Amino acid sequence: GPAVGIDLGTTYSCVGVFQHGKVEIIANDQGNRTTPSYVAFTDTERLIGDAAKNQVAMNPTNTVFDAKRLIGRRFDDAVVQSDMKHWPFMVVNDAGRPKVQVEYKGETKSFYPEEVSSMVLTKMKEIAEAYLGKTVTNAVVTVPAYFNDSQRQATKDAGTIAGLNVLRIINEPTAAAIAYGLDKKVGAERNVLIFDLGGGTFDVSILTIEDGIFEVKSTAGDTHLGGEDFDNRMVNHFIAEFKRKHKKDISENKRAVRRLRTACERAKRTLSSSTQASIEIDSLYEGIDFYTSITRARFEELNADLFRGTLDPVEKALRDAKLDKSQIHDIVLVGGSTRIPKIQKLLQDFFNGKELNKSINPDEAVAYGAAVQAAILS
Numbered sequence: 353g354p355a356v357g358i359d360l361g362t363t364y365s366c367v368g369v370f371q372h373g374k375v376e377i378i379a380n381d382q383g384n385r386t387t388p389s390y391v392a393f394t395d396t397e398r399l400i401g402d403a404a405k406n407q408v409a410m411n412p413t414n415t416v417f418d419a420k421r422l423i424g425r426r427f428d429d430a431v432v433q434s435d436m437k438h439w440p441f442m443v444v445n446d447a448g449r450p451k452v453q454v455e456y457k458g459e460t461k462s463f464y465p466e467e468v469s470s471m472v473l474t475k476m477k478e479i480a481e482a483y484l485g486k487t488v489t490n491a492v493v494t495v496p497a498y499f500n501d502s503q504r505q506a507t508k509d510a511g512t513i514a515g516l517n518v519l520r521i522i523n524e525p526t527a528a529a530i531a532y533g534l535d536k537k538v539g540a541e542r543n544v545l546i547f548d549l550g551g552g553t554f555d556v557s558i559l560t561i562e563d564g565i566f567e568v569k570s571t572a573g574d575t576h577l578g579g580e581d582f583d584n585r586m587v588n589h590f591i592a593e594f595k596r597k598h599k600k601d602i603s604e605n606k607r608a609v610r611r612l613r614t615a616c617e618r619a620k621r622t623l624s625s626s627t628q629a630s631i632e633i634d635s636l637y638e639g640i641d642f643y644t645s646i647t648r649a650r651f652e653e654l655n656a657d658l659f660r661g662t663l664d665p666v667e668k669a670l671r672d673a674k675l676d677k678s679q680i681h682d683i684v685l686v687g688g689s690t691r692i693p694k695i696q697k698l699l700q701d702f703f704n705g706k707e708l709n710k711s712i713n714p715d716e717a718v719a720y721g722a723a724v725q726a727a728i729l730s
């Protein structure tokens with residue numbers, strides 16, 4: 353049974369497999385190459401992935417996400433305390449360990465963060481198995497470079513309870529390098545910058561590779577900056593526009609807002625390829641259909657300060673690593689948000705026209721590298 357590579361993201365997960373020298377990123381039941389890290393509990397079932405995310409608008413208290421932010425931490429953890437104040441689901445304390453509390457089939461139940469992740473891990477496992485036509489046992493799971501021993505332990509545990517023989521836990525930036533082959537022995541030292549901007553986190557890693565051996569020289573970023581923040585800006589923009597056109601503030605209606613955001617995230621993806629996209633939502637508030645559009649120019653304008661500030665963590669990374677722009681040999685893009693044109697322009701201008709590594713879908717790069725690593729480990 354082939355060993356697979358799994359990227360367990362805060363917002364999206366991806367699974368790949370190495371077969372015949374080639375790596376294949378496995379698409380799910382809905383045909384997506386990445387599946388949301390969402391779990392939802394209802395009166396009749398346990399929904400995982402797209403099915404879960406597709407119903408969050410009508411089950412905010414029983415649809416769990418962001419488990420990667422909980423995994424391996426304590427309830428008393430300041431991070432946990434801050435974050436929990438924004439999740440629409442319950443987080444309880446159990447002997448100092450944080451636990452998610454939801455209502456499943458009328459009964460009230462709670463789960464440890466690692467149990468939630470194992471649910472996502474199981475979905476990936478079945479996605480692979482469905483594709484491969486064989487049971488997947490061995491696997492390599494990826495984790496941010498800054499995860500401590502507890503967080504790594506928890507990620508490993510989530511895997512074992514999902515029935516996966518976790519061959520190894522390797523850092524995400526290292527996985528991204530291997531995907532590009534930046535680990536090949538060339539008889540010299542090589543500094544690589546991993547620019548990872550996914551759904552909810554931004555990480556900048558500077559790796560040094562000497563004889564196939566990696567050395568994370570520095571890291572920086574923002575655990576609270578990602579594609580979701582860009583969507584927010586569009587939502588606020590459209591709320592104002594709806595109010596401007598219909599004198600009706602839809603902010604209070606949580607269903608209206610959640611449906612609008614879904615339309616925005618979709619428009620955003622389209623903007624990375626086209627110059628403008630349309631927002632077509634039937635009866636957003638009351639019976640008023642919201643039909644409008646946005647241009648890429650307007651979109652860039654809405655997030656100008658966010659995009660620009662993305663360069664601060666990069667400068668900090670160089671500073672700490674004790675390297676200048678000139679010294680970094682390779683720059684690889686990771687995360688679905690790196691598909692945004694203005695962000696690609698921004699990074700190149702910073703690195704004075706230097707070419708960016710981006711032939712492998714940025715949101716599949718981590719999975720891609722893990723798959724190769726799984727293959728060699730098997």
Ligand SMILES: Nc1ncnc2c1ncn2[C@@H]1O[C@H](COP(=O)(O)OP(=O)(O)NP(=O)(O)O)[C@@H](O)[C@H]1O
Nearest residue numbers: 361362363364550551552553579621687688689715
């Ligand atoms: N074409 C696109 N243009 C812009 N953003 C995109 C595009 N395709 C996907 N995304 C965004 O990329 C994000 C998904 O990133 P991805 O790297 O798959 O997440 P992840 O691994 O969960 N990362 P993180 O959330 O940081 O742990 C969401 O905010 C998507 O809207």
Ligand SMILES: [Ca+2]
Nearest residue numbers: 361524548550
């Ligand atoms: Ca990541």
